Amino acid sequence: VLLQRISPLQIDPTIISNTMSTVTLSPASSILGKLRPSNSDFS
Amino acid sequence: MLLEPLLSGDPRMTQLAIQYQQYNGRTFNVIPEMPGSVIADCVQLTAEV
Amino acid sequence: EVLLLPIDHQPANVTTPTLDFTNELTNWRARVCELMKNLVDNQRYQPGW
């Protein structure tokens, strides 16, 4: 938590969705469903 | 969509080109030249003034 | 006086290129993506697709 409250880096997982812009199964959507960028928990 | 497909990565060292490749490694590239601009010309002129 | 790290470190400046391939982490990501392209290039290792 001390390393969180100092660091300039913020972890912002919508960069993945912005590079994808996606929408059977497609491999572009399968990695989104596998990475789950809605989850904000990077402990 | 005015250069929205250019800002998904690094906007510093941008370049535009295309290529395709056959089976045997043979690649055919097309690098179009950048033609002149008048907006950038007038911005650099105003910057000079 | 020293602190062991599992990652090589460099002096801290801000305008590093985003596509720098001299640091071991971005080089690692690039090589893993290249090997998965080689693994997926021909259709073998994935039939039934």
Question: For tokens 């990695």, what's the residue?
Answer: A31
Method: cryo-EM
- Give the span between the Cα atoms of C33 and A12, in whole angstroms: 22
Residue C43: which residues within 8 A CB-CB, separation 6 or more? C49
Q: How far is A28 from chain B (nearest CA, A)?
A: 16
For residue A42, give the amino acid letter. F
Tell me the C-alpha distance between C49 and C40, whole Å. Answer: 12
- Please tell me what DSSP assigns to residue B6: G
- Quick one: resolution in A? 3.4
Q: How far is B44 from chain A (nearest CA, A)?
A: 32
Place of tokens 């399968």: A30
Integer Cα distance of A28 and C29 in angstroms? 18
Residues from chain B contacting residue A19 (CB–CB below 8 Å): 8-9
Give the long-range contacts of residues B30-35, CB within 8 A, separation 24 or more.
Answer: none
Query: Which is nearest to A35 in space by CA: A9, A13, A19?
Result: A13
- Residue C2: phi and psi, rounded to 5, are -110, 160
Helices and strands counted in chain A (H then E) = 2, 0
